[PDB]
From a paper:
A very high-resolution 1.50 Å structure of the OBD alone was obtained. Although the crystals grew in the presence of ssDNA of the nick sequence, there was no DNA bound to the protein. The main differences observed are located on flexible regions, such as the loop between β-strands β2–β3, which includes the residues coordinating the Mn2+ metal ion (data not shown). However, alignment of these two structures reveals clear differences located in the flexible loop connecting β2 and β3 β-strands and in the loop connecting α2 and β4, due to its proximity to the DNA.
Numbering used by the authors: 4 to 132
The structure:
Protein backbone atom coordinates (compact mmCIF):
# COMPACT_ATOMS: atom_id res chain seq x y z
CA UNK A 1 0.00 0.00 0.00
CA UNK A 2 3.07 2.36 -0.49
CA UNK A 3 4.50 3.67 -3.81
CA UNK A 4 6.86 6.42 -5.09
CA UNK A 5 5.00 7.76 -8.18
CA UNK A 6 1.68 9.64 -7.92
CA UNK A 7 -0.64 11.89 -9.88
CA UNK A 8 -3.37 14.32 -8.98
CA UNK A 9 -5.55 17.03 -10.55
CA UNK A 10 -5.67 20.74 -9.56
CA UNK A 11 -8.50 23.07 -10.60
CA UNK A 12 -8.09 26.89 -10.77
CA UNK A 13 -11.24 27.67 -8.68
CA UNK A 14 -9.95 25.66 -5.65
CA UNK A 15 -6.20 26.51 -5.63
CA UNK A 16 -4.57 29.75 -4.44
CA UNK A 17 -3.29 32.11 -7.20
CA UNK A 18 0.32 31.31 -6.04
CA UNK A 19 -0.18 27.52 -6.21
CA UNK A 20 2.75 26.96 -8.56
CA UNK A 21 5.24 28.88 -6.35
CA UNK A 22 3.87 26.89 -3.36
CA UNK A 23 4.57 23.58 -5.16
CA UNK A 24 8.07 25.01 -5.81
CA UNK A 25 8.62 24.93 -1.99
CA UNK A 26 8.32 21.14 -1.89
CA UNK A 27 11.43 18.96 -2.04
CA UNK A 28 10.23 16.42 -4.67
CA UNK A 29 10.42 16.45 -8.47
CA UNK A 30 7.11 17.20 -10.20
CA UNK A 31 5.95 17.64 -13.78
CA UNK A 32 2.84 19.81 -14.33
CA UNK A 33 0.79 19.33 -17.48
CA UNK A 34 -0.14 22.19 -19.74
CA UNK A 35 -3.53 23.61 -18.79
CA UNK A 36 -6.19 21.05 -19.83
CA UNK A 37 -8.87 23.49 -20.99
CA UNK A 38 -10.12 21.36 -23.94
CA UNK A 39 -10.60 17.85 -22.52
CA UNK A 40 -13.86 16.13 -23.57
CA UNK A 41 -16.54 16.03 -20.83
CA UNK A 42 -18.03 12.92 -19.25
CA UNK A 43 -21.10 14.94 -18.12
CA UNK A 44 -24.27 14.43 -20.17
CA UNK A 45 -24.94 17.64 -22.15
CA UNK A 46 -21.54 19.39 -21.53
CA UNK A 47 -18.71 19.52 -24.09
CA UNK A 48 -15.55 20.27 -22.03
CA UNK A 49 -14.22 19.02 -18.72
CA UNK A 50 -13.60 21.78 -16.11
CA UNK A 51 -10.15 23.33 -16.92
CA UNK A 52 -7.48 21.70 -14.72
CA UNK A 53 -3.84 20.68 -14.43
CA UNK A 54 -2.38 17.19 -13.90
CA UNK A 55 0.66 16.84 -11.61
CA UNK A 56 3.11 13.92 -11.77
CA UNK A 57 4.75 13.68 -8.34
CA UNK A 58 7.90 11.64 -7.44
CA UNK A 59 8.22 10.80 -3.69
CA UNK A 60 11.78 10.30 -2.38
CA UNK A 61 10.83 7.01 -0.65
CA UNK A 62 7.76 4.76 -0.75
CA UNK A 63 4.77 6.57 0.84
CA UNK A 64 0.96 6.23 0.89
CA UNK A 65 -1.22 8.15 -1.55
CA UNK A 66 -3.11 9.42 1.55
CA UNK A 67 0.14 10.99 2.87
CA UNK A 68 0.59 12.86 -0.44
CA UNK A 69 -3.04 14.05 -0.39
CA UNK A 70 -2.64 15.39 3.18
CA UNK A 71 0.67 17.14 2.25
CA UNK A 72 -0.87 18.95 -0.76
CA UNK A 73 -4.00 19.88 1.27
CA UNK A 74 -1.75 21.45 3.99
CA UNK A 75 0.16 23.34 1.26
CA UNK A 76 -2.72 24.50 -1.02
CA UNK A 77 -5.76 24.26 1.28
CA UNK A 78 -8.32 21.60 2.21
CA UNK A 79 -10.46 22.29 -0.92
CA UNK A 80 -7.43 22.05 -3.29
CA UNK A 81 -7.47 18.26 -3.79
CA UNK A 82 -9.99 15.37 -3.51
CA UNK A 83 -7.63 12.40 -4.01
CA UNK A 84 -4.17 11.22 -5.18
CA UNK A 85 -3.67 8.27 -7.57
CA UNK A 86 -0.71 5.85 -7.64
CA UNK A 87 1.25 5.73 -10.91
CA UNK A 88 2.72 2.36 -11.96
CA UNK A 89 3.96 3.38 -15.47
CA UNK A 90 5.70 6.70 -15.02
CA UNK A 91 6.76 7.15 -18.69
CA UNK A 92 3.20 6.62 -19.95
CA UNK A 93 1.86 8.99 -17.27
CA UNK A 94 4.40 11.66 -18.35
CA UNK A 95 3.16 11.28 -21.93
CA UNK A 96 -0.44 11.41 -20.66
CA UNK A 97 0.27 15.00 -19.46
CA UNK A 98 -0.12 16.05 -23.12
CA UNK A 99 -2.46 13.12 -24.08
CA UNK A 100 0.36 11.47 -26.09
CA UNK A 101 0.36 8.09 -24.31
CA UNK A 102 -0.75 5.21 -26.53
CA UNK A 103 -3.99 4.90 -24.47
CA UNK A 104 -4.76 8.64 -24.79
CA UNK A 105 -4.26 8.52 -28.57
CA UNK A 106 -6.38 5.34 -28.82
CA UNK A 107 -9.18 7.31 -27.11
CA UNK A 108 -8.64 10.32 -29.47
CA UNK A 109 -7.98 12.68 -26.51
CA UNK A 110 -7.07 16.34 -27.09
CA UNK A 111 -3.28 16.75 -27.68
CA UNK A 112 -1.44 19.52 -25.81
CA UNK A 113 1.94 21.21 -26.38
CA UNK A 114 4.96 19.68 -24.62
CA UNK A 115 6.44 23.21 -24.42
CA UNK A 116 3.75 24.02 -21.81
CA UNK A 117 4.89 21.26 -19.38
CA UNK A 118 6.37 22.82 -16.23
CA UNK A 119 9.15 20.89 -14.45
CA UNK A 120 9.81 21.49 -10.73
CA UNK A 121 12.94 20.40 -8.84
CA UNK A 122 14.78 19.28 -11.95
CA UNK A 123 12.25 16.53 -12.87
CA UNK A 124 13.83 14.35 -15.50
CA UNK A 125 11.67 11.47 -16.79
CA UNK A 126 14.81 9.49 -17.87
CA UNK A 127 15.67 8.97 -14.16
CA UNK A 128 12.33 7.32 -13.19
CA UNK A 129 11.53 4.79 -15.97
CL1 LIG B 1 8.58 17.83 0.29
CL1 LIG C 1 -0.49 25.88 -20.49
CL1 LIG D 1 8.91 12.11 -0.24
CL1 LIG E 1 5.95 12.63 -0.31
CL1 LIG F 1 3.62 7.08 4.18
CL1 LIG G 1 -0.05 4.02 -14.22
CL1 LIG H 1 -5.90 7.79 -21.37
CL1 LIG I 1 -9.87 14.74 -24.26
CL1 LIG J 1 -6.07 17.05 -30.65
CL1 LIG K 1 8.81 16.32 -23.20
CL1 LIG L 1 15.87 22.69 -9.34
MN1 LIG M 1 -7.00 16.40 -18.11
Amino acid sequence: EKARYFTFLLYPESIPSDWELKLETLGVPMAISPLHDKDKSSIKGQKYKKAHYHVLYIAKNPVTADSVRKKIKLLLGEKSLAMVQVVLNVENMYLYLTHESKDAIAKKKHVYDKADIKLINNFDIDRYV
